[PDB]
Design an enzyme around this catalytic site. Sequence first.
Site, PDB file in Angstrom:
ATOM      1  CG  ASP A  35      68.317  -5.979  20.776  1.00 40.88           C
ATOM      2  OD1 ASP A  35      68.199  -5.026  21.570  1.00 40.88           O
ATOM      3  OD2 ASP A  35      67.756  -6.036  19.647  1.00 40.88           O
ATOM      4  CB  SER A 199      64.479   8.262  33.969  1.00 39.04           C
ATOM      5  OG  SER A 199      65.428   9.140  34.544  1.00 39.04           O
TER       6      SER A 199
HETATM    7  C1  LIG Z   1      72.752  -3.377  11.978  1.00 38.63           C
HETATM    8  O1  LIG Z   1      72.996  -3.848  13.308  1.00 38.63           O
HETATM    9  C2  LIG Z   1      71.975  -3.743  14.210  1.00 38.63           C
HETATM   10  C3  LIG Z   1      70.767  -3.109  13.977  1.00 38.63           C
HETATM   11  C4  LIG Z   1      69.782  -3.134  14.946  1.00 38.63           C
HETATM   12  C5  LIG Z   1      69.983  -3.772  16.159  1.00 38.63           C
HETATM   13  C6  LIG Z   1      68.890  -3.825  17.190  1.00 38.63           C
HETATM   14  N1  LIG Z   1      68.669  -2.516  17.862  1.00 38.63           N
HETATM   15  C7  LIG Z   1      71.207  -4.391  16.390  1.00 38.63           C
HETATM   16  C8  LIG Z   1      72.199  -4.390  15.427  1.00 38.63           C
HETATM   17  O2  LIG Z   1      73.368  -5.059  15.626  1.00 38.63           O
END
Ligand SMILES: COc1ccc(CN)cc1O
Length: 330
Positions: A35, A199
């Site tokens: 992430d 962008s």
């Molecule tokens: C519920 O799963 C998620 C919720 C939020 C994120 C981060 N944006 C990653 C995930 O896998």
Amino acid sequence: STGSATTTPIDSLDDAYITPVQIGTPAQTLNLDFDTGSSDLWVFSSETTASEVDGQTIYTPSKSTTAKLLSGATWSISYGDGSSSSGDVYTDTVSVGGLTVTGQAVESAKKVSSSFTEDSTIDGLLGLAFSTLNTVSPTQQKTFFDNAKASLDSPVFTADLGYHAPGTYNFGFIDTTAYTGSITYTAVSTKQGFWEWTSTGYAVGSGTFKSTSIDGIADTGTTLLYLPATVVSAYWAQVSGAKSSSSVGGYVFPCSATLPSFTFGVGSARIVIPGDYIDFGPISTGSSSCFGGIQSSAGIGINIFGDVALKAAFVVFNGATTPTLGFASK
Ligand SMILES: COc1ccc(CN)cc1O
């Protein structure tokens, strides 16, 4: 040093991508959601409330000879979708695709929100935004990338996400066989802790390119492309029958439609997202209404170049002293 790991969609819609990560000694392999929009490496664990674990693989620090409790440390995070998790912290050895960091903070979940419980395929997150966002208290911890950086051949990682197919995360090198043409680099602001960039504009389908600055973040942990309402309205206006649905929570379109492409600018370069990438399928099983992959950022407070955009490119996250982002077609 370098590392290279395959990343795999969790489902037929590319809702997220998982990458195997080795934690501890002997290794415990967990499939984590890499992430670039957050900065905590957290895992389902032997400490996670039992009723909140449903099929995930867990990290058991008591079975790792290199695990050490980071005394007094706790963490708690909320994400943009309202999901959350929290717990305590160990340090341990973490390896990704052959690249090893010793003493990495591994945040062990005691609690996770229902959305995490319900995703049996995701065993935790590995944050790759800037360490200033890390939530560990009272001593903030570094990301896997920050810890690895000095050892890497080059202080970079790359994201090469597939459309309905596996892809690759590389650390420490740029695979020049993985993209076409050249990589265009663009400035990053780290002021909000994100890979934030601007962008240079957009086009819808075969339409003319609109030169306009769009500030947003490169976020592998967000599924969709979230852009200003003006841009999103211009896109969906080219799809017969498309509409914003307050009940569904965004733009929907007839599943019988052929979607136009969407182009975004990176400096003088252009990345083209094929129409198919913007189809997220029936809103509910058997429905002929489909959910759109380009949605308004109006309620979010930031534009997000999530997986829909990033998967159309080979993306370089350059963690040099002055960070930058690179994009190439592929
Ligand atoms: C519920 O799963 C998620 C919720 C939020 C994120 C981060 N944006 C990653 C995930 O896998």
